[PDB]
Structures are given as C-alpha cells and as structure tokens.
mmCIF file of C-alpha atoms in Angstrom:
data_model
loop_
_atom_site.group_PDB
_atom_site.id
_atom_site.type_symbol
_atom_site.label_atom_id
_atom_site.label_comp_id
_atom_site.label_asym_id
_atom_site.label_seq_id
_atom_site.Cartn_x
_atom_site.Cartn_y
_atom_site.Cartn_z
ATOM 1 C CA UNK A 1 1.319 19.626 1.337
ATOM 2 C CA UNK A 2 1.585 17.879 -3.135
ATOM 3 C CA UNK A 3 -1.379 16.249 -4.417
ATOM 4 C CA UNK A 4 -3.046 16.022 -8.018
ATOM 5 C CA UNK A 5 -5.414 13.430 -9.519
ATOM 6 C CA UNK A 6 -6.578 12.753 -12.304
ATOM 7 C CA UNK A 7 -10.022 12.146 -13.376
ATOM 8 C CA UNK A 8 -12.977 10.863 -12.380
ATOM 9 C CA UNK A 9 -14.038 12.524 -16.409
ATOM 10 C CA UNK A 10 -14.906 15.171 -17.477
ATOM 11 C CA UNK A 11 -12.894 16.417 -14.352
ATOM 12 C CA UNK A 12 -8.818 16.493 -16.051
ATOM 13 C CA UNK A 13 -5.771 17.514 -13.888
ATOM 14 C CA UNK A 14 -6.568 18.466 -10.705
ATOM 15 C CA UNK A 15 -3.465 19.595 -8.755
ATOM 16 C CA UNK A 16 -2.915 20.756 -5.095
ATOM 17 C CA UNK A 17 -1.276 23.733 -4.851
ATOM 18 C CA UNK A 18 -2.496 24.253 -8.201
ATOM 19 C CA UNK A 19 1.564 24.340 -9.895
ATOM 20 C CA UNK A 20 2.993 22.078 -7.401
ATOM 21 C CA UNK A 21 6.468 21.258 -6.741
ATOM 22 C CA UNK A 22 6.257 17.932 -6.481
ATOM 23 C CA UNK A 23 4.834 17.058 -10.217
ATOM 24 C CA UNK A 24 3.398 18.933 -13.558
ATOM 25 C CA UNK A 25 0.586 17.476 -15.417
ATOM 26 C CA UNK A 26 1.960 16.386 -19.068
ATOM 27 C CA UNK A 27 -0.698 15.370 -21.066
ATOM 28 C CA UNK A 28 -4.757 13.414 -19.807
ATOM 29 C CA UNK A 29 -3.805 10.670 -17.017
ATOM 30 C CA UNK A 30 -0.143 11.375 -17.566
ATOM 31 C CA UNK A 31 2.873 14.000 -15.139
ATOM 32 C CA UNK A 32 6.005 14.170 -14.496
ATOM 33 C CA UNK A 33 7.617 13.759 -11.426
ATOM 34 C CA UNK A 34 10.167 16.783 -10.619
ATOM 35 C CA UNK A 35 11.048 15.660 -7.021
ATOM 36 C CA UNK A 36 12.922 13.366 -5.787
ATOM 37 C CA UNK A 37 10.953 10.953 -3.403
ATOM 38 C CA UNK A 38 8.327 8.867 -1.849
ATOM 39 C CA UNK A 39 5.826 9.287 -3.596
ATOM 40 C CA UNK A 40 2.171 6.646 -2.687
ATOM 41 C CA UNK A 41 -0.294 6.149 -5.788
ATOM 42 C CA UNK A 42 -4.376 5.825 -5.722
ATOM 43 C CA UNK A 43 -6.688 4.501 -8.168
ATOM 44 C CA UNK A 44 -9.677 3.256 -9.856
ATOM 45 C CA UNK A 45 -10.392 1.586 -12.772
ATOM 46 C CA UNK A 46 -14.035 1.046 -13.342
ATOM 47 C CA UNK A 47 -14.116 -1.675 -16.229
ATOM 48 C CA UNK A 48 -17.416 -1.060 -18.605
ATOM 49 C CA UNK A 49 -19.385 -4.428 -18.748
ATOM 50 C CA UNK A 50 -20.088 -3.820 -22.272
ATOM 51 C CA UNK A 51 -17.621 -3.468 -23.633
ATOM 52 C CA UNK A 52 -17.379 -4.260 -27.367
ATOM 53 C CA UNK A 53 -13.832 -4.519 -28.411
ATOM 54 C CA UNK A 54 -11.148 -7.003 -29.214
ATOM 55 C CA UNK A 55 -8.626 -5.934 -26.686
ATOM 56 C CA UNK A 56 -8.593 -8.161 -23.347
ATOM 57 C CA UNK A 57 -8.974 -5.834 -20.685
ATOM 58 C CA UNK A 58 -6.102 -4.782 -19.099
ATOM 59 C CA UNK A 59 -4.885 -1.457 -16.889
ATOM 60 C CA UNK A 60 -1.819 -0.477 -16.573
ATOM 61 C CA UNK A 61 0.031 1.595 -14.267
ATOM 62 C CA UNK A 62 3.336 2.244 -16.408
ATOM 63 C CA UNK A 63 6.892 4.202 -14.967
ATOM 64 C CA UNK A 64 9.072 5.932 -18.543
ATOM 65 C CA UNK A 65 6.318 3.863 -20.559
ATOM 66 C CA UNK A 66 7.163 -0.508 -18.267
ATOM 67 C CA UNK A 67 3.740 -1.217 -16.308
ATOM 68 C CA UNK A 68 4.493 -1.573 -12.104
ATOM 69 C CA UNK A 69 0.945 -2.483 -12.016
ATOM 70 C CA UNK A 70 -0.941 -3.886 -14.050
ATOM 71 C CA UNK A 71 -4.626 -5.030 -13.784
ATOM 72 C CA UNK A 72 -6.774 -7.750 -15.495
ATOM 73 C CA UNK A 73 -10.004 -7.862 -13.809
ATOM 74 C CA UNK A 74 -13.380 -6.673 -15.631
ATOM 75 C CA UNK A 75 -16.113 -7.492 -13.036
ATOM 76 C CA UNK A 76 -15.341 -4.905 -10.672
ATOM 77 C CA UNK A 77 -14.175 -1.775 -9.717
ATOM 78 C CA UNK A 78 -10.408 -2.514 -8.778
ATOM 79 C CA UNK A 79 -8.262 -0.002 -6.280
ATOM 80 C CA UNK A 80 -4.597 0.102 -6.983
ATOM 81 C CA UNK A 81 -2.366 1.443 -4.335
ATOM 82 C CA UNK A 82 1.490 1.424 -4.008
ATOM 83 C CA UNK A 83 4.245 3.503 -2.645
ATOM 84 C CA UNK A 84 7.381 4.052 -4.285
ATOM 85 C CA UNK A 85 10.535 6.179 -4.417
ATOM 86 C CA UNK A 86 10.692 8.330 -8.390
ATOM 87 C CA UNK A 87 13.195 10.242 -9.166
ATOM 88 C CA UNK A 88 13.405 13.802 -10.830
ATOM 89 C CA UNK A 89 12.331 13.171 -14.911
ATOM 90 C CA UNK A 90 9.859 9.910 -14.335
ATOM 91 C CA UNK A 91 6.679 10.063 -16.460
ATOM 92 C CA UNK A 92 4.287 8.475 -14.863
ATOM 93 C CA UNK A 93 0.940 7.067 -16.355
ATOM 94 C CA UNK A 94 -2.400 4.841 -16.838
ATOM 95 C CA UNK A 95 -2.379 3.288 -19.847
ATOM 96 C CA UNK A 96 -5.413 1.101 -21.369
ATOM 97 C CA UNK A 97 -5.731 -1.721 -22.799
ATOM 98 C CA UNK A 98 -9.105 -0.120 -25.267
ATOM 99 C CA UNK A 99 -9.892 3.622 -24.304
ATOM 100 C CA UNK A 100 -13.541 1.319 -24.467
ATOM 101 C CA UNK A 101 -13.451 -1.173 -21.999
ATOM 102 C CA UNK A 102 -13.442 1.224 -18.819
ATOM 103 C CA UNK A 103 -15.214 4.177 -18.124
ATOM 104 C CA UNK A 104 -13.054 6.974 -17.807
ATOM 105 C CA UNK A 105 -16.455 9.078 -15.860
ATOM 106 C CA UNK A 106 -15.516 6.012 -13.300
ATOM 107 C CA UNK A 107 -12.272 5.854 -13.392
ATOM 108 C CA UNK A 108 -9.342 8.131 -12.220
ATOM 109 C CA UNK A 109 -6.050 8.080 -10.117
ATOM 110 C CA UNK A 110 -3.498 10.037 -8.289
ATOM 111 C CA UNK A 111 -0.269 11.060 -6.234
ATOM 112 C CA UNK A 112 0.071 12.507 -2.743
ATOM 113 C CA UNK A 113 4.552 12.646 -1.931
ATOM 114 C CA UNK A 114 5.795 11.577 1.535
ATOM 115 C CA UNK A 115 8.522 12.386 2.334
ATOM 116 C CA UNK A 116 11.364 13.817 -0.276
ATOM 117 C CA UNK A 117 14.627 12.493 1.318
ATOM 118 C CA UNK A 118 18.112 13.109 0.782
ATOM 119 C CA UNK A 119 18.716 9.672 -0.330
ATOM 120 C CA UNK A 120 16.174 9.618 -2.725
ATOM 121 C CA UNK A 121 18.761 11.635 -5.061
ATOM 122 C CA UNK B 1 -3.429 13.846 13.296
ATOM 123 C CA UNK B 2 -6.653 11.488 12.915
ATOM 124 C CA UNK B 3 -6.375 7.536 13.650
ATOM 125 C CA UNK B 4 -8.628 4.655 14.828
ATOM 126 C CA UNK B 5 -7.823 1.033 15.339
ATOM 127 C CA UNK B 6 -10.800 -2.008 15.979
ATOM 128 C CA UNK B 7 -9.312 -4.778 19.025
ATOM 129 C CA UNK B 8 -7.332 -7.238 19.016
ATOM 130 C CA UNK B 9 -10.114 -8.217 21.135
ATOM 131 C CA UNK B 10 -10.892 -7.376 23.880
ATOM 132 C CA UNK B 11 -9.646 -3.600 22.916
ATOM 133 C CA UNK B 12 -12.724 -2.450 21.198
ATOM 134 C CA UNK B 13 -12.787 1.006 18.712
ATOM 135 C CA UNK B 14 -9.700 2.922 19.855
ATOM 136 C CA UNK B 15 -9.703 6.094 18.006
ATOM 137 C CA UNK B 16 -7.309 9.528 18.094
ATOM 138 C CA UNK B 17 -7.907 11.682 18.756
ATOM 139 C CA UNK B 18 -11.117 10.473 21.210
ATOM 140 C CA UNK B 19 -14.219 11.213 19.599
ATOM 141 C CA UNK B 20 -12.291 12.449 16.135
ATOM 142 C CA UNK B 21 -12.868 15.093 13.221
ATOM 143 C CA UNK B 22 -11.967 12.142 10.367
ATOM 144 C CA UNK B 23 -14.390 8.752 11.182
ATOM 145 C CA UNK B 24 -17.029 8.381 14.155
ATOM 146 C CA UNK B 25 -17.348 4.071 15.435
ATOM 147 C CA UNK B 26 -20.746 3.118 14.055
ATOM 148 C CA UNK B 27 -20.295 -0.621 15.574
ATOM 149 C CA UNK B 28 -17.733 -3.788 16.856
ATOM 150 C CA UNK B 29 -15.599 -3.540 13.078
ATOM 151 C CA UNK B 30 -17.439 -0.974 11.654
ATOM 152 C CA UNK B 31 -16.388 2.912 10.948
ATOM 153 C CA UNK B 32 -18.485 6.123 9.391
ATOM 154 C CA UNK B 33 -15.979 8.150 7.254
ATOM 155 C CA UNK B 34 -17.145 12.011 7.949
ATOM 156 C CA UNK B 35 -14.637 13.290 5.891
ATOM 157 C CA UNK B 36 -13.659 13.254 2.563
ATOM 158 C CA UNK B 37 -10.276 12.786 1.835
ATOM 159 C CA UNK B 38 -7.564 9.983 1.264
ATOM 160 C CA UNK B 39 -7.464 7.276 3.951
ATOM 161 C CA UNK B 40 -4.612 4.468 4.371
ATOM 162 C CA UNK B 41 -6.102 2.029 6.013
ATOM 163 C CA UNK B 42 -4.304 -1.624 7.924
ATOM 164 C CA UNK B 43 -4.839 -4.540 10.404
ATOM 165 C CA UNK B 44 -4.015 -8.191 10.898
ATOM 166 C CA UNK B 45 -7.030 -11.120 10.015
ATOM 167 C CA UNK B 46 -5.744 -14.526 12.002
ATOM 168 C CA UNK B 47 -7.334 -17.153 11.069
ATOM 169 C CA UNK B 48 -8.216 -20.076 13.498
ATOM 170 C CA UNK B 49 -6.605 -22.883 12.640
ATOM 171 C CA UNK B 50 -8.926 -25.089 14.828
ATOM 172 C CA UNK B 51 -11.696 -24.000 12.679
ATOM 173 C CA UNK B 52 -14.975 -26.718 12.406
ATOM 174 C CA UNK B 53 -16.670 -24.424 10.512
ATOM 175 C CA UNK B 54 -19.018 -24.865 7.373
ATOM 176 C CA UNK B 55 -17.252 -21.855 5.995
ATOM 177 C CA UNK B 56 -14.871 -21.176 3.616
ATOM 178 C CA UNK B 57 -12.322 -19.315 4.659
ATOM 179 C CA UNK B 58 -12.942 -15.686 3.294
ATOM 180 C CA UNK B 59 -12.120 -12.368 5.286
ATOM 181 C CA UNK B 60 -13.912 -8.743 3.720
ATOM 182 C CA UNK B 61 -12.815 -4.937 4.216
ATOM 183 C CA UNK B 62 -16.080 -3.261 3.113
ATOM 184 C CA UNK B 63 -16.657 0.066 0.953
ATOM 185 C CA UNK B 64 -20.728 0.600 1.714
ATOM 186 C CA UNK B 65 -20.845 -3.219 1.588
ATOM 187 C CA UNK B 66 -18.633 -4.121 -0.891
ATOM 188 C CA UNK B 67 -15.970 -6.479 -0.528
ATOM 189 C CA UNK B 68 -12.597 -4.518 -1.870
ATOM 190 C CA UNK B 69 -10.027 -6.296 -0.076
ATOM 191 C CA UNK B 70 -10.340 -10.296 0.011
ATOM 192 C CA UNK B 71 -8.189 -12.513 2.091
ATOM 193 C CA UNK B 72 -8.428 -15.949 1.904
ATOM 194 C CA UNK B 73 -5.469 -17.968 3.341
ATOM 195 C CA UNK B 74 -6.312 -19.251 6.422
ATOM 196 C CA UNK B 75 -2.659 -20.477 6.839
ATOM 197 C CA UNK B 76 -1.381 -17.526 8.286
ATOM 198 C CA UNK B 77 -1.894 -14.332 9.962
ATOM 199 C CA UNK B 78 -2.308 -11.870 6.955
ATOM 200 C CA UNK B 79 -1.533 -8.301 7.357
ATOM 201 C CA UNK B 80 -3.937 -5.640 4.795
ATOM 202 C CA UNK B 81 -3.253 -2.448 3.487
ATOM 203 C CA UNK B 82 -5.069 0.253 0.593
ATOM 204 C CA UNK B 83 -4.767 3.686 0.134
ATOM 205 C CA UNK B 84 -9.001 4.938 -0.519
ATOM 206 C CA UNK B 85 -10.374 8.165 -1.525
ATOM 207 C CA UNK B 86 -13.533 8.059 0.797
ATOM 208 C CA UNK B 87 -16.468 9.820 1.223
ATOM 209 C CA UNK B 88 -18.320 11.681 4.242
ATOM 210 C CA UNK B 89 -21.515 9.126 4.956
ATOM 211 C CA UNK B 90 -19.391 5.806 3.734
ATOM 212 C CA UNK B 91 -18.955 3.161 5.467
ATOM 213 C CA UNK B 92 -15.757 0.939 6.167
ATOM 214 C CA UNK B 93 -15.592 -2.527 8.098
ATOM 215 C CA UNK B 94 -14.639 -6.289 8.689
ATOM 216 C CA UNK B 95 -16.431 -8.869 7.894
ATOM 217 C CA UNK B 96 -16.186 -12.538 8.471
ATOM 218 C CA UNK B 97 -17.048 -15.350 6.647
ATOM 219 C CA UNK B 98 -17.497 -17.313 10.093
ATOM 220 C CA UNK B 99 -16.970 -15.608 13.507
ATOM 221 C CA UNK B 100 -15.574 -18.771 14.718
ATOM 222 C CA UNK B 101 -12.643 -18.606 12.026
ATOM 223 C CA UNK B 102 -11.031 -16.155 13.057
ATOM 224 C CA UNK B 103 -8.835 -15.630 16.482
ATOM 225 C CA UNK B 104 -10.177 -12.331 17.251
ATOM 226 C CA UNK B 105 -7.883 -11.558 20.130
ATOM 227 C CA UNK B 106 -4.619 -11.170 17.092
ATOM 228 C CA UNK B 107 -6.980 -9.631 14.382
ATOM 229 C CA UNK B 108 -6.948 -5.813 14.865
ATOM 230 C CA UNK B 109 -7.298 -2.806 11.395
ATOM 231 C CA UNK B 110 -7.847 0.752 11.977
ATOM 232 C CA UNK B 111 -7.037 3.647 8.841
ATOM 233 C CA UNK B 112 -5.176 6.895 9.317
ATOM 234 C CA UNK B 113 -6.701 9.764 7.648
ATOM 235 C CA UNK B 114 -3.403 10.967 5.326
ATOM 236 C CA UNK B 115 -4.138 14.082 3.539
ATOM 237 C CA UNK B 116 -7.655 15.973 2.865
ATOM 238 C CA UNK B 117 -7.690 17.690 -0.614
ATOM 239 C CA UNK B 118 -10.281 19.984 -1.912
ATOM 240 C CA UNK B 119 -10.831 17.414 -5.355
ATOM 241 C CA UNK B 120 -12.103 15.045 -3.142
ATOM 242 C CA UNK B 121 -15.262 16.112 -1.831
ATOM 243 C CA UNK C 1 9.895 13.020 9.773
ATOM 244 C CA UNK C 2 12.426 9.300 10.246
ATOM 245 C CA UNK C 3 13.898 7.304 7.326
ATOM 246 C CA UNK C 4 15.934 4.733 6.281
ATOM 247 C CA UNK C 5 16.925 3.063 3.618
ATOM 248 C CA UNK C 6 19.562 0.262 2.393
ATOM 249 C CA UNK C 7 20.770 0.171 -0.504
ATOM 250 C CA UNK C 8 20.983 -0.007 -3.533
ATOM 251 C CA UNK C 9 24.801 -1.434 -3.824
ATOM 252 C CA UNK C 10 27.909 0.323 -2.692
ATOM 253 C CA UNK C 11 24.894 2.218 -0.907
ATOM 254 C CA UNK C 12 23.786 0.639 2.740
ATOM 255 C CA UNK C 13 22.113 1.490 5.701
ATOM 256 C CA UNK C 14 20.887 5.525 4.786
ATOM 257 C CA UNK C 15 18.685 6.989 7.420
ATOM 258 C CA UNK C 16 17.638 10.698 7.923
ATOM 259 C CA UNK C 17 18.246 11.934 10.626
ATOM 260 C CA UNK C 18 21.344 10.034 10.854
ATOM 261 C CA UNK C 19 20.715 8.539 14.250
ATOM 262 C CA UNK C 20 16.744 8.040 13.503
ATOM 263 C CA UNK C 21 14.055 7.945 16.959
ATOM 264 C CA UNK C 22 12.227 5.207 14.957
ATOM 265 C CA UNK C 23 14.753 1.985 14.449
ATOM 266 C CA UNK C 24 17.589 1.656 14.418
ATOM 267 C CA UNK C 25 20.525 -0.283 12.288
ATOM 268 C CA UNK C 26 21.747 -4.135 12.512
ATOM 269 C CA UNK C 27 23.543 -5.286 9.563
ATOM 270 C CA UNK C 28 23.094 -5.486 6.393
ATOM 271 C CA UNK C 29 19.753 -5.687 4.956
ATOM 272 C CA UNK C 30 18.491 -5.571 8.694
ATOM 273 C CA UNK C 31 17.230 -3.668 10.951
ATOM 274 C CA UNK C 32 15.357 -2.984 14.388
ATOM 275 C CA UNK C 33 11.924 -0.672 14.778
ATOM 276 C CA UNK C 34 12.928 1.052 18.057
ATOM 277 C CA UNK C 35 9.320 3.048 18.120
ATOM 278 C CA UNK C 36 5.675 1.971 18.429
ATOM 279 C CA UNK C 37 3.659 2.553 15.539
ATOM 280 C CA UNK C 38 2.480 2.721 11.903
ATOM 281 C CA UNK C 39 5.101 2.568 9.763
ATOM 282 C CA UNK C 40 5.063 1.895 6.011
ATOM 283 C CA UNK C 41 7.693 0.223 3.633
ATOM 284 C CA UNK C 42 8.445 0.586 0.358
ATOM 285 C CA UNK C 43 11.398 -1.029 -2.051
ATOM 286 C CA UNK C 44 12.469 -2.697 -5.592
ATOM 287 C CA UNK C 45 13.683 -6.110 -5.625
ATOM 288 C CA UNK C 46 15.858 -6.657 -9.063
ATOM 289 C CA UNK C 47 16.461 -9.704 -9.635
ATOM 290 C CA UNK C 48 19.491 -10.591 -12.049
ATOM 291 C CA UNK C 49 18.322 -11.953 -15.642
ATOM 292 C CA UNK C 50 21.291 -14.507 -15.423
ATOM 293 C CA UNK C 51 21.548 -16.600 -12.846
ATOM 294 C CA UNK C 52 22.916 -19.973 -12.156
ATOM 295 C CA UNK C 53 22.307 -21.443 -8.639
ATOM 296 C CA UNK C 54 19.931 -24.719 -7.429
ATOM 297 C CA UNK C 55 17.397 -22.146 -5.366
ATOM 298 C CA UNK C 56 14.022 -21.139 -7.086
ATOM 299 C CA UNK C 57 13.416 -17.530 -7.482
ATOM 300 C CA UNK C 58 11.966 -15.605 -3.006
ATOM 301 C CA UNK C 59 13.057 -12.668 -2.225
ATOM 302 C CA UNK C 60 11.561 -12.690 1.731
ATOM 303 C CA UNK C 61 10.773 -9.865 3.311
ATOM 304 C CA UNK C 62 10.498 -9.993 7.745
ATOM 305 C CA UNK C 63 9.247 -10.285 10.750
ATOM 306 C CA UNK C 64 10.969 -11.650 13.338
ATOM 307 C CA UNK C 65 12.190 -14.022 10.467
ATOM 308 C CA UNK C 66 8.797 -14.459 9.393
ATOM 309 C CA UNK C 67 7.794 -13.712 6.159
ATOM 310 C CA UNK C 68 5.294 -10.881 6.062
ATOM 311 C CA UNK C 69 5.704 -10.479 1.893
ATOM 312 C CA UNK C 70 7.473 -12.885 -0.300
ATOM 313 C CA UNK C 71 8.479 -11.855 -4.167
ATOM 314 C CA UNK C 72 8.675 -14.715 -6.342
ATOM 315 C CA UNK C 73 8.730 -13.537 -10.236
ATOM 316 C CA UNK C 74 12.174 -13.443 -11.088
ATOM 317 C CA UNK C 75 10.763 -11.863 -14.805
ATOM 318 C CA UNK C 76 11.511 -7.941 -13.571
ATOM 319 C CA UNK C 77 11.754 -6.198 -11.084
ATOM 320 C CA UNK C 78 9.628 -6.061 -8.949
ATOM 321 C CA UNK C 79 8.238 -3.896 -5.720
ATOM 322 C CA UNK C 80 7.154 -3.789 -2.624
ATOM 323 C CA UNK C 81 4.901 -1.911 -0.340
ATOM 324 C CA UNK C 82 3.035 -2.208 2.673
ATOM 325 C CA UNK C 83 1.711 -0.668 5.848
ATOM 326 C CA UNK C 84 2.296 -2.219 9.067
ATOM 327 C CA UNK C 85 2.254 -1.587 12.664
ATOM 328 C CA UNK C 86 4.617 -2.202 14.271
ATOM 329 C CA UNK C 87 6.835 -3.435 17.672
ATOM 330 C CA UNK C 88 9.884 -2.729 19.610
ATOM 331 C CA UNK C 89 11.939 -4.739 19.348
ATOM 332 C CA UNK C 90 10.708 -6.318 16.107
ATOM 333 C CA UNK C 91 13.641 -7.603 13.296
ATOM 334 C CA UNK C 92 12.833 -6.215 9.682
ATOM 335 C CA UNK C 93 14.685 -7.579 7.023
ATOM 336 C CA UNK C 94 14.778 -8.361 3.507
ATOM 337 C CA UNK C 95 15.879 -12.066 3.074
ATOM 338 C CA UNK C 96 17.389 -13.656 -0.360
ATOM 339 C CA UNK C 97 16.533 -17.431 -1.289
ATOM 340 C CA UNK C 98 20.008 -17.440 -3.317
ATOM 341 C CA UNK C 99 22.076 -13.553 -2.769
ATOM 342 C CA UNK C 100 23.180 -14.416 -6.661
ATOM 343 C CA UNK C 101 19.227 -14.631 -7.909
ATOM 344 C CA UNK C 102 19.699 -11.033 -6.954
ATOM 345 C CA UNK C 103 21.091 -7.969 -8.336
ATOM 346 C CA UNK C 104 21.808 -5.706 -5.684
ATOM 347 C CA UNK C 105 23.220 -2.571 -6.838
ATOM 348 C CA UNK C 106 19.335 -2.405 -8.245
ATOM 349 C CA UNK C 107 17.716 -3.628 -4.695
ATOM 350 C CA UNK C 108 16.851 -2.002 -2.050
ATOM 351 C CA UNK C 109 14.173 -0.858 0.889
ATOM 352 C CA UNK C 110 12.834 1.390 3.396
ATOM 353 C CA UNK C 111 10.900 2.291 5.432
ATOM 354 C CA UNK C 112 8.703 5.884 6.532
ATOM 355 C CA UNK C 113 7.177 5.859 9.921
ATOM 356 C CA UNK C 114 4.059 7.607 9.689
ATOM 357 C CA UNK C 115 2.509 7.946 13.070
ATOM 358 C CA UNK C 116 2.890 6.978 16.666
ATOM 359 C CA UNK C 117 -0.258 5.978 17.286
ATOM 360 C CA UNK C 118 -0.726 5.474 21.721
ATOM 361 C CA UNK C 119 -2.307 2.329 21.305
ATOM 362 C CA UNK C 120 -0.154 0.902 19.138
ATOM 363 C CA UNK C 121 1.687 0.259 22.310
#
C-alpha cells in the first residue's frame, strides 16, 4: 500500500512506506502527488473554541492552491473525506484561515492510494 | 478483508469473516472497533413517510456516543458514507430520534477495513 | 481490480480490464452493475460559465433513474464521491439538466469495485 498522514502535532509527516512511491512530502500540511491514480483523503479538523483573532473560521483542503473542500463549522471537530483522481505534480495541502483557530494537536489529514488505472494518466 | 453490515431487518449483524479480527458486534446497530486503522462506513437510511410521533427526523452515526454524521431529510432514502481513522475500543452505532420514524426493513449500515497503518495507533 | 471511467470527452467509456466482470457500459454516461458489492463512485462536474439556456444548474448521479446525488453549484468544478452497495442490474448514470450547462471536456465519472461481500446479495 501507499499511505501518508500529517499530524496531529507534534507528529509531522508519517509515510508508509517511509519513502513511498505515490507521494512526496513538501512541508508541514503539504504533499505532492507522484503517481497518477485514485486517492482517498481523510482527516480531522479540531477548532480551537478559545480563538481570539480576526478571521472567520475556515479550513480548506486544496489542490494546486484551490480549495476542493471547505470546513466552516467552529463548534465541533469535523471529519473530512473524499475520493479524487490526481495527477503527478498535484500539490495537496490543508490550509487554515488562521493557525490559531485550530487545535493542531488534534488536527490531521492523510491520503491512501486506492488504485492506479491506466486511464488516470 | 474485514467487513460487517447490520440490517436491513430482519437481518442483524452480518460479518465477513464471521468472527472478524477488525470489529466485534455489541448489540443491534452497534459495534466495537478492535483494530486501529482506516475504515470506510456506508449505509442507507429509509424514512417512514407515515411517521406519527413527536420527534423531528434525525438519524445519527455516532462514535463513542457523539454524532459524526447526522441525516435530517425525511423525504427520501439517504445514503451515508465516510472514511475515518478509528482506535481499538471505539464504539460505532447508528441512532434514531425515534425507532418509528425509519423503515428498519430498508435501513442498514456497514463498515469495511481499508488499511491498518502503523500511524493509526 | 475492476474500475471504469466515462470521459472527459472526447474519451468515452474506459474500462479496466476492458471487459470487466463488475460492470457493463450501456451508453454515454451510463453503465450497468453486474456484480453485487460495495462500489466507490468518483467524478468531476465542470460547469460551463457561459451557459445561455433555460435550465437551472443541476447534475444528478442516478441509480435506476433516481438521483442519489445532486450537484447544483454553477460557480466551480464540483467533485463527487460516494460509497454504495449496488445490486446486479442497477443502472448508474450521470444526468445533466442541460447538456449545454456543463463542459463535457472536463466532466467525468467513474467507479471502483471495493469488495464483494456475501451479504451484498
């Protein structure tokens, strides 16, 4: 298999196998797809109920800097999930309207390679 | 593989294999996760269009007594699905605002173990 | 494995393997389930931002002519995904409120057979 998870802090990128064929970590919360195919994304976003800043609550799962999912409920932990066809070179990341509006010690996301069809490239 | 389905009535828990490593049935609509890992949940909730009771329509998929999904549309059969990381000991159940507001003979839910990453424990 | 994808145009049905055990193509955007089991559906719906017709924007994923998902946002590409238990003979299709309100050259859907439990038949 090929799976990866970022977080929750203090854990960073956890890849199985450690140098997987399907993805490459770029930086915290961000990876690059290496293998064309169908991927399942999962995750958990934990709002900080004591947030004291300016930003509306919003967490975005992004593909090449564009939000493919947006989570906007600040009252509960929200789970995310999806199935997507990705191309080699696609950049996938979880982005926060403010770092301070989530509990990073209870927030994570990951990815599982499901299949690699010829039609995905 | 490791898969389980409850219902629709009169079927109860259907586990494959019959004593699976990944989950244990507890009672109708309720199971316990035995193996840390990534699970896909699926299901179908069929409202009873002749319900005559007091409760608003709501069906909850719950993890340790907390709703991780809520279905509130009483006009159509609703499908549920999700991908989740669960821990051994987690209790997963489908809960109804009223037993009488769903057609249990057309309502079911189940679970499929997808992968068991080291990072899930 | 057993996977299929329709589109985006000019690609039509792409099945792997080419004559798969699990599904049979019927016509553009439409297939028939041959094997009882749990399937993951995925897809992408690209609205045409220059649509000049009469219909409200709506794209339906249908099972036996009934919409199991509806996509109604004309402002962005929308991804679809779901996990479903299907029966042999079920007809699955993507249906548009108007052919002219989507960009068929950037719209596709597909299916992956996940497992074939005895309880699915």
